[PDB]
Amino acid sequence: ERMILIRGLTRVITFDDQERELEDADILIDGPKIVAVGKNLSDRSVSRTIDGRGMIALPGLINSHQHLYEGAMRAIPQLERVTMASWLEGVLTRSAGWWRDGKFGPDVIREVARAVLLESLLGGITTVADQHPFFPGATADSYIDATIEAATDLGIRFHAVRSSMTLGKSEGGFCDDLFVEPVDRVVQHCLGLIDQYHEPEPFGMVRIALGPCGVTHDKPELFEAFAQMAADYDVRLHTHFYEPLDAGMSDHLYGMTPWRFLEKHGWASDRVWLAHAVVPPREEIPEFADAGVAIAHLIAPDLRLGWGLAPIREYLDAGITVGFGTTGSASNDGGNLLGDLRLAALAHRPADPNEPEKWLSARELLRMATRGSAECLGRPDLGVLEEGRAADIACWRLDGVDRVGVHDPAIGLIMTGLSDRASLVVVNGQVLVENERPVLADLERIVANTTALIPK
Ligand SMILES: [Zn+2]
């Protein structure tokens, strides 16, 4: 029950209400929470002191959109250069083929999730929201049990987002029977996950969310169902939003825009955060803001699939909450959140070539990846380095040869480096990474183990 001190951090970016940063400053930790943040803190009831000299400290990075099972589908030649239609077809084909061959059961997904989630810690990420849409079995399998087990083993903070594809071919589905479950089955299963796994109190380490694949992949009945369950059980809602093909297929299926659909079926609320949001009509943006929905920027896939640049500046001008994510490793193909910020830093600029003020800055992006994502997930206890918040902390060394000459360390973190490896990482007050190595997890064993279970 004794405390931890991180002394002499070169720089501490807090993302509190003032955007306070501190130099040569400390973080005092008591169990799961941050006791204090400032210069020269007392080491009185302290049982361990850690030298932060030459490090920048940020709140733990929070990846607000993952598909862990896709770590098994990395760098596939046939999928290197495909449009979404071929990509989606190729992923489902593979996951389906592997499953019924017996090579893709929960025990496999568990070890795939273990590796990617460990990669996540190693990249400064302390919270991950995974969206798992793949439930064949006919009793809904224990895939989410499997990812929760991996996360819990490793000590990373975790949001399981129960996903699906309830709208089949005969209903206008571009999906498959195998993966089409009845709404009630999806609803019943979610109820059980909440009762069993959901930790609604401050500093909760596992939380359940409800997440249809999308407005054109799921029955409107599921959206209304989840909207009731979210109010009743006080959990959050998640889905994909304004992918380029959506506004076309939504209108074909419902004669309305995806936003209008969400609004009808109870999802224009502050319990909702939304993935990608690449191509909305501009007139709806002020409606996103009044409704209090959050959005997650996912640059690597939006680029990987040819989709382009989501109007992130417009969301920020509108006062909409923006978070950040990597999406799955079949369209990234990494879980490197930090590296992905450099992508967003650079690729937005050609769209406003003469208005650099519009361009996203390093500090806006880091905010997205911490406090922005915290608010996507409805975690007022995360994403900020201040007393009373969770002791979720990620630190990077600034004294490498690849970062000589850096004038601002926050900007340098995005714009320079041969490596995005974090040095020190603290989740829930537990040191899980030190000297860029896992302190509790066995890295080599995990790598050999997971590698042996990857389907050919
Ligand atoms: Zn996704």
From TrEMBL:
Source species of the chain: Paenarthrobacter aurescens
Single GO MF annotation: amidase activity
Protein name in UniProt: Triazine hydrolase
Residues binding Zn(2+), per UniProt: H65, H67, H240
Domain Amidohydrolase-related per the UniProt entry, residue ranges: 56-402
Superkingdom of source: Bacteria
Alphabetically ordered keywords of this record: Hydrolase, Metal-binding, Plasmid, Zinc
Any Pfam family: Amidohydro_1
Lineage: Bacteria, Bacillati, Actinomycetota, Actinomycetes, Micrococcales
Residue ranges of the TM segments: none
